[PDB]
Amino acid sequence: NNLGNTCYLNSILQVLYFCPGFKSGVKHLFNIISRKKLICSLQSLIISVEQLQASFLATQPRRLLNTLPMYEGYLQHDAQEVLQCILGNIETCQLLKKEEELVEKLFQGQLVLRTRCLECESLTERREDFQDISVPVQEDKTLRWAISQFASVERIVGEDKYFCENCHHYTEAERSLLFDKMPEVITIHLKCFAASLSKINTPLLTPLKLSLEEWSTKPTNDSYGLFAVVMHSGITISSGHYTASVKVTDLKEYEGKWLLFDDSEVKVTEEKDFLNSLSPSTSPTSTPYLLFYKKL
Amino acid sequence: MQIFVKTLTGKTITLEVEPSDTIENVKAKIQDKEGIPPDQQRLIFAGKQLEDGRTLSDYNIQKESTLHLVLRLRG
Amino acid sequence: KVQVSYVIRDEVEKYNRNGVNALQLDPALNRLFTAGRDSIIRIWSVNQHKQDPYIASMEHHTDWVNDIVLCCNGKTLISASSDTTVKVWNAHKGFCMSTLRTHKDYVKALAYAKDKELVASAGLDRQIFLWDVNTLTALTVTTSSLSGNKDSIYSLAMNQLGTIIVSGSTEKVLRVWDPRTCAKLMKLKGHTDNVKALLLNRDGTQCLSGSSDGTIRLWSLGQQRCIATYRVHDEGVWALQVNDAFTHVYSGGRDRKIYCTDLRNPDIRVLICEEKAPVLKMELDRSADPPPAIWVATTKSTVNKWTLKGIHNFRITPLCTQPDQVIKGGASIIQCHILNDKRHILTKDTNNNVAYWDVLKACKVEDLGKVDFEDEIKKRFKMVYVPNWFSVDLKTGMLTITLDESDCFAAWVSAKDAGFSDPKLNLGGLLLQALLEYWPRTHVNGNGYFQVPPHTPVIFGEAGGRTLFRLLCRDSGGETESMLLNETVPQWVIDITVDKNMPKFNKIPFYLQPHRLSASDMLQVRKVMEHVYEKIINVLAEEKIELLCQDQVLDPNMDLRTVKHFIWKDLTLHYRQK
Ligand SMILES: COc1ncnc(C2CC2)c1-c1ncc2c(n1)n(Cc1ccc(-c3nc(C(F)(F)F)cn3C)cc1)c(=N)n2CC(F)(F)F
Ligand SMILES: *NC[C@H](*)CS(C)(=O)=O
Numbered sequence: 047n048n049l050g051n052t053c054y055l056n057s058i059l060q061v062l063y064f065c066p067g068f069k070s071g072v073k074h075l076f077n078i079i080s081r082k083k084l085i086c087s088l089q090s091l092i093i094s095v096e097q098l099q100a101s102f103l104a105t106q107p108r109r110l111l112n113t114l115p116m117y118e119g120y121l122q123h124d125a126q127e128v129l130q131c132i133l134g135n136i137e138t139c140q141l142l143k144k145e146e147e148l149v150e151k152l153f154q155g156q157l158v159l160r161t162r163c164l165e166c167e168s169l170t171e172r173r174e175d176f177q178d179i180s181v182p183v184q185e186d187k188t189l190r191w192a193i194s195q196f197a198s199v200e201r202i203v204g205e206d207k208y209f210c211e212n213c214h215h216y217t218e219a220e221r222s223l224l225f226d227k228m229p230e231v232i233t234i235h236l237k238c239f240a241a242s243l244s245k246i247n248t249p250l251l252t253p254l255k256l257s258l259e260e261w262s263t264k265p266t267n268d269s270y271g272l273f274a275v276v277m278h279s280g281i282t283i284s285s286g287h288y289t290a291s292v293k294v295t296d297l298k299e300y301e302g303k304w305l306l307f308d309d310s311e312v313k314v315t316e317e318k319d320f321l322n323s324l325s326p327s328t329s330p331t332s333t334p335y336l337l338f339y340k341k342l
Numbered sequence: 343m344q345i346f347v348k349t350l351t352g353k354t355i356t357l358e359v360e361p362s363d364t365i366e367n368v369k370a371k372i373q374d375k376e377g378i379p380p381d382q383q384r385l386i387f388a389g390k391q392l393e394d395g396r397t398l399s400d401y402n403i404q405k406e407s408t409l410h411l412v413l414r415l416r417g
Numbered sequence: 418k419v420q421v422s423y424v425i426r427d428e429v430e431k432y433n434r435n436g437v438n439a440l441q442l443d444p445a446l447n448r449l450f451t452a453g454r455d456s457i458i459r460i461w462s463v464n465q466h467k468q469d470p471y472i473a474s475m476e477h478h479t480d481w482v483n484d485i486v487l488c489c490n491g492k493t494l495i496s497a498s499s500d501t502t503v504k505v506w507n508a509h510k511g512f513c514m515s516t517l518r519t520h521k522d523y524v525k526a527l528a529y530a531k532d533k534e535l536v537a538s539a540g541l542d543r544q545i546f547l548w549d550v551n552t553l554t555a556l557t558v559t560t561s562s563l564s565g566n567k568d569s570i571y572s573l574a575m576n577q578l579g580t581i582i583v584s585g586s587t588e589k590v591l592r593v594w595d596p597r598t599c600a601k602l603m604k605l606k607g608h609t610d611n612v613k614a615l616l617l618n619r620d621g622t623q624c625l626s627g628s629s630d631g632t633i634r635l636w637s638l639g640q641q642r643c644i645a646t647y648r649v650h651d652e653g654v655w656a657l658q659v660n661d662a663f664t665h666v667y668s669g670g671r672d673r674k675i676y677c678t679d680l681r682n683p684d685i686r687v688l689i690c691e692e693k694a695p696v697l698k699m700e701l702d703r704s705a706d707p708p709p710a711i712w713v714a715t716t717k718s719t720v721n722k723w724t725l726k727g728i729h730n731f732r733i734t735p736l737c738t739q740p741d742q743v744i745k746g747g748a749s750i751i752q753c754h755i756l757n758d759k760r761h762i763l764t765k766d767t768n769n770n771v772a773y774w775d776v777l778k779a780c781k782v783e784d785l786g787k788v789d790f791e792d793e794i795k796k797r798f799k800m801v802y803v804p805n806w807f808s809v810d811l812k813t814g815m816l817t818i819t820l821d822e823s824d825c826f827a828a829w830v831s832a833k834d835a836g837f838s839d840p841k842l843n844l845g846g847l848l849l850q851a852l853l854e855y856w857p858r859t860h861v862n863g864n865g866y867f868q869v870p871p872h873t874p875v876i877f878g879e880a881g882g883r884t885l886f887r888l889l890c891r892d893s894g895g896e897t898e899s900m901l902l903n904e905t906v907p908q909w910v911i912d913i914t915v916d917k918n919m920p921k922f923n924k925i926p927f928y929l930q931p932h933r934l935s936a937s938d939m940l941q942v943r944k945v946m947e948h949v950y951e952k953i954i955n956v957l958a959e960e961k962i963e964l965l966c967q968d969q970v971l972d973p974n975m976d977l978r979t980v981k982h983f984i985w986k987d988l989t990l991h992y993r994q995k
């Protein structure tokens with residue numbers, strides 16, 4: 047059904063299918079196309095997959111592959127690349143709605159960047175939209191520490207000198223990041239590769255809970271529960287069999303039990319058992335690559 | 343102009359890009375200050391990959407803009 | 418990694434341009450030393466009866482001057498600058514005597530032990546060097562490094578007897594050393610932000626600090642703890658001065674206010690008048706007790722002298738409204754624009770004045786007056802294209818032109834285009850020939866066209882760092898100057914000036930199609946017309962053919978390199994007969 051030469055698109059589709067409010071929205075976009083005249087391909091795959099769930103309770107993912115200058119023949123590619131390509135192809139909504147929101151709400155946020163000259167003490171604010179957080183795995187051992195390193199007070203010194211136009215000289219500054227709008231689900235991208243070209247096999251203790259209030263701009267009270275992980279399995283940047291495990295969202299006895307999408311085999315594990323796998327207590331082979339944090 | 347770049351370790355690198363160049367010139371400067379081949383770099387700005395063969399005026403990059411540097415991990 | 422540079426300035430600069438960074442006083446001779454953001458150090462006369470207060474200036478630095486210390490009973494002056502150099506002067510005659518270049522980054526601090534004759538210096542490179550003055554005036558001196566530190570040092574102080582030295586950095590933690598044994602003594606913590614002002618007692622028992630948070634703390638060196646804390650300032654304190662017996666402190670910062678805070682009881686507060694710019698490096702007149710005057714410095718080019726007479730008898734309304742002694746200042750340049758033909762520059766300065774500068778002749782030809790900048794820029798539009806070959810730096814409030822090896826020889830122009838009297842000139846080569854003209858190595862048994870004025874400084878500096886040399890264009894035929902020039906100039910300047918090596922040229926391909934050729938960049942379309950005519954025959958060439966580019970009829974005088982840049986968006990052309 048799923049021949050093992052498309053190991054990135056398969057994992058991305060399996061992770062996205064369980065995202066909240068995705069299968070419902072895509073059906074609406076196709077319904078607008080339905081009476082007005084990639085969207086037509088996604089709706090076809092969703093219908094086929096839902097047919098198999100009835101039995102348990104050849105999918106042919108190549109239909110999307112044909113529709114989606116970097117995808118020729120049997121090759122090896124990245125997962126975040128195809129995720130961004132799909133989320134960019136999904137443009138179509140704006141073009142359809144102009145003639146008279148599934149990404150702007152699900153996967154979209156805003157940041158605030160503050161730079162402070164250390165000579166005149168004058169601040170500057172800019173706004174930049176973010177779709178994922180690239181976080182340093184380890185410095186040249188905690189998710190909170192890594193996020194703090196990504197977004198906290200950091201001084202640019204040495205050859206990297208801020209050019210302040212209030213002083214008209216090369217001064218020293220400090221930088222900060224703040225979150226303004228947080229999407230429905232927040233994805234974290236781990237920079238496993240090391241420039242030193244290499245790959246670090248020491249994972250991070252990823253918590254099953256999260257709270258973004260120290261680095262936030264406004265006082266908010268909401269948590270973040272992990273619900274999907276995409277894991278590599280190789281030892282270098284040349285190849286590797288991608289694997290994805292997704293929590294069950296909402297069948298009579300499977301609730302609260304993580305899944306494990308291996309190569310053409312579906313295995314049901316337990317939350318306590320799975321949590322002891324990617325943790326660094328036992329040296330693993332698979333290294334987490336992306337983490338998806340559904341709200342609540 | 344002057345723009346910032348966040349490398350793999352998380353440090354910030356400063357470039358004077360002169361916003362009339364292509365992506366290849368920016369990648370060449372990044373490789374000069376970083377020693378990474380230009381065929382393996384993935385520049386990301388505002389949650390959207392920077393494609394080669396285009397200038398910077400289309401991406402409305404102005405003042406101090408942070409470009410995230412990531413590599414490509416194949417599988 | 419070596420760049421040649423020069424500046425355009427008047428022969429006699431009499432007024433400040435960018436601001437003031439440090440102050441000093443000489444009660445023995447009644448003179449004031451003003452080391453501003455401009456590289457020049459001036460010696461004013463603080464006597465009220467002098468209607469034109471000015472004495473000889475000292476111009477040897479290439480960047481900002483951060484701090485100056487008057488040593489050896491006013492005989493010598495020590496100055497530290499942004500470029501990693503510490504110099505020694507002769508304040509009686511205002512000429513440099515020595516130079517020390519054993520620093521890696523900017524220098525921002527300078528202390529002085531009057532009863533010990535020592536000088537310490539600290540910078541952004543996290544190093545502290547202990548220097549003995551008595552071996553500096555008479556003279557590769559020895560070093561005494563005293564630095565266990567982890568981040569940049571922004572201020573530093575030393576007690577009068579030269580036994581305790583305290584430094585403030587970005588850790589908000591003060592470190593205490595001992596000059597004689599180079600040992601570590603204490604670690605004073607309890608601050609929140611950067612520390613930019615430290616004052617110590619005569620015996621080193623107590624220390625005063627002021628942070629950018631906006632608080633002033635009184636420490637103790639007999640007890641590793643702070644005693645009292647005052648927060649009378651809303652913004653950070655950048656300047657700090659104290660009375661003789663540690664009884665009163667005068668403070669000021671970004672608030673743009675100056676207070677006089679008592680120390681025994683902090684509820685007594687008088688408000689000296691508020692200056693119009695952020696006060697930095699306040700200076701006090703210590704002629705008699707109590708101090709009857711105070712000199713302030715700001716980010717603008719003006720120094721004022723406030724008088725204190727209402728203190729101790731005032732029983733918050735400001736005490737003063739106007740200064741007593743005023744020192745005038747000029748205007749600095751804040752905007753520049755390079756014209757389409759890269760020779761002239763349109764600069765706009767404070768007080769809204771625009772001037773029309775030259776680069777090749779290194780002079781000013783005209784000032785345009787009170788006109789709008791955008792309309793003036795749009796009016797002066799030329800239909801040419803010359804690749805850029807220099808850069809303009811607006812620091813120090815003056816024009817600085819830097820020539821880099823990558824693109825100095827990247828501009829070829831015609832003889833009539835340059836205005837002289839067909840030769841194919843090179844602008845960078847002519848400039849570099851004109852600069853080093855008194856150098857005896859360039860002679861043979863700006864060459865024949867013009868002459869740069871013989872007072873422009875010439876600077877050989879590294880890539881964004883220390884300057885290896887500093888020369889006057891007139892003073893180059895001497896012995897020591899030649900000795901240093903034989904080793905300081907790079908190779909790519911020698912191959913062009915000392916030897917006659919013709920720099921390389923440029924070519925560009927272009928497709929011709931009757932709807933591959935390689936030709937020089939500055940080739941007029943007049944020659945592409947003569948070429949197509951003489952190849953496809955079955956005045957006459959000018960009249961019987963016209964070239965079209967993007968369906969625009971081409972003028973038979975504009976050359977190929979501007980067709981690519983202004984009309985085309987490899988280049989392709991089309992030709993039709995008649
Ligand atoms: C292109 O492929 C896909 N694209 C997008 N999304 C998905 C998956 C579901 C998001 C697939 C996909 N990929 C491989 C599958 C596959 N679907 N199915 C059908 C199936 C049947 C029952 C269940 C299931 N649901 C629960 C519940 F409800 F308890 F959570 C428990 N279980 C076992 C899951 C999937 C399957 N058998 N394989 C393995 C084999 F085809 F190779 F054999
Ligand atoms: N990285 C490609 C997918 C996995 S495999 C078995 O084709 O290499």
Ligand SMILES: [Zn+2]
Nearest residue numbers: 163166210213
């Ligand atoms: Zn500044």
